[PDB]
């Protein structure tokens, strides 16, 4: 079977740069029937190019692919932020069809603050039992970014989960999402709650709070 | 769009799945469907195919003896049947269309024929678990004077507690899709999955404008509608 792989795993630029994925087989590709495909976020794969070299319907004069026998390569001539996503070559000179593992493109861009708010918990929700503060940190982009939950100012740990976006598609930031979870009357014995953010576009840590209870 | 699939579903460990490609154009004509399948986080790897209009199929060694493909003309629709599911096979299966243009024939000229796929279902994720299904509790993540910034406020929906993967979320049915943000799910530690949709509008909309999240969880055979309105005082 032949073993696609691919280089770099993770290729880190900004937009405008160009991109050049590395694709080498571990034997010789017939015909050059080498593939690329583009896997963009929550999205199923997309044909870039076939034959190794020929773009296909409907894709853009920026990407081009290049190659023979073992060594094949896709370009990005001048990189967009929509580009953002896995790229994967396929081979199919010879049964079974296999994949490279594949090359991750991340856009670097520059730093911008996070737009943070906070939402206290449902009272439908907290009828049943559990209460979930959620804490909401929009379009930022160093991906870095610190979030500690206070409630009563007492600083929380061990019961937030958070996740992030990838990056935008539009705008190469990210948004995260911190969830505190408490139950019922642990969150009732309690008043103030309070989500405090750090990041590198923040000059200090900004806090969003809301006292429970209160309209 | 005109590749449509079956929907996510979780199955049993020994049991199989018939995973369904129906072409929209009401007809296979030449062309070949293949089946490639993707763990979450990972990468791509082809199972096999079938290409109707030659009564020809085959597929991938590391299936053998567990796969079968078919394709009826009557409904335009192609299947495959993975039998004897264990945990690994835990996965995204998309039907991916191929197609030959070898003068006339299914391949025979030119340089490279019919191993590419120009067009891709949306996936089904197959999820093999012994832990039985269950739908999402959706909860309102309301706009208020704590969610506002300049002349913007965010608001969304929490989608609780389901399993297992996945969950898809729209706005408005599909009308709103810019500031929309939907976070990957986390697994809690109760076993089941958690996530969340916000999306940013004009504040002077808030009145006048509904703002429905729809929560699709198929291995449930869920769908819940969520309106989420500023919370009264």
């Known amino acids: 079977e032949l073993v696609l792989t691919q280089s770099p795993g993770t290729l880190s630029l900004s937009a405008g740069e160009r991109a050049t994925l590395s694709c080498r087989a571990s034997?010789?590709?017939?015909?050059?029937?080498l593939a690329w495909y583009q896997q963009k976020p929550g999205q199923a794969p997309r044909l870039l190019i076939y034959?190794?070299?020929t773009r296909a319907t409907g894709i853009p004069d920026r990407f081009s692919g290049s190659g023979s026998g073992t060594d094949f390569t896709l370009t990005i001539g001048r990189l967009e932020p929509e580009d953002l996503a896995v790229y994967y070559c396929?081979?199919?000179?010879?049964?079974?069809?296999?994949f490279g593992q594949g090359t991750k493109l991340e856009i670097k861009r520059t730093v911008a603050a996070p737009s943070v708010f906070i939402f206290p918990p449902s009272d439908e929700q907290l009828k049943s039992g559990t209460a979930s503060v959620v804490c909401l940190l929009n379009n930022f982009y160093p991906r870095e970014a610190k979030v500690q939950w206070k409630v009563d100012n007492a600083l929380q740990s061990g019961n937030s989960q958070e996740s992030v976006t990838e990056q935008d598609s539009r705008d190469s930031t990210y948004s995260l999402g911190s969830t505190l979870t408490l139950s019922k009357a642990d969150y009732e014995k309690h008043k103030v709650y309070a989500c405090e953010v750090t990041h590198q576009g923040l000059s200090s840590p900004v806090t969003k709070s809301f006292n429970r209870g209160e309209c | 769009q005109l590749l449509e699939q079956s929907g996510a579903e979780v199955k049993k460990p020994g049991s199989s799945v018939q995973v369904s490609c129906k072409a929209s154009?009401?007809?296979?004509?030449?062309?070949?469907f293949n089946w490639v399948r993707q763990a979450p986080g990972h990468g791509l790897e082809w199972m096999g195919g079938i290409i109707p209009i030659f009564g020809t199929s085959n597929y991938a060694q590391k299936f053998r003896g567990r796969v079968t493909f078919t394709a009826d003309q009557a409904t335009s629709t192609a299947y495959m049947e993975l039998t004897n599911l264990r945990s690994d096979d835990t996965a995204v299966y998309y039907c991916?269309?191929?197609?030959?243009?070898?003068?006339?024939?299914?391949?025979?000229?030119?340089?490279?024929?019919?191993?590419?796929?120009?067009?891709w279902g949306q996936g089904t994720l197959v999820t093999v678990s012994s832990a039985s299904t269950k739908g999402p509790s959706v909860f309102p993540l309301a706009p208020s004077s704590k969610s506002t910034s300049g002349g913007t406020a965010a608001l969304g929906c929490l989608v609780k507690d389901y399993f297992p993967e996945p969950v898809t979320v729209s706005w408005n049915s599909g009308a709103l899709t810019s500031g929309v943000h939907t976070f990957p799910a986390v697994l809690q530690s109760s076993g089941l999955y958690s996530l969340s949709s916000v999306v940013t509008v004009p504040s002077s909309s808030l009145g006048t404008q509904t703002y429905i999240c729809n929560v699709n969880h198929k291995p449930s055979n869920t769908k819940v509608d969520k309106k989420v309105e500023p919370k009264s005082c």
């Open positions: 991916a269309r191929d197609f030959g243009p070898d003068w006339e024939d299914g391949d025979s000229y030119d340089g490279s024929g019919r191993g590419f796929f120009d067009f």
């Open positions: 396929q081979q199919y000179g010879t049964s079974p069809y296999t």
């Open positions: 154009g009401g007809t296979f004509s030449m062309y070949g």
């Open positions: 034997q010789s590709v017939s015909s050059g029937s």
């Open positions: 034959g190794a070299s």
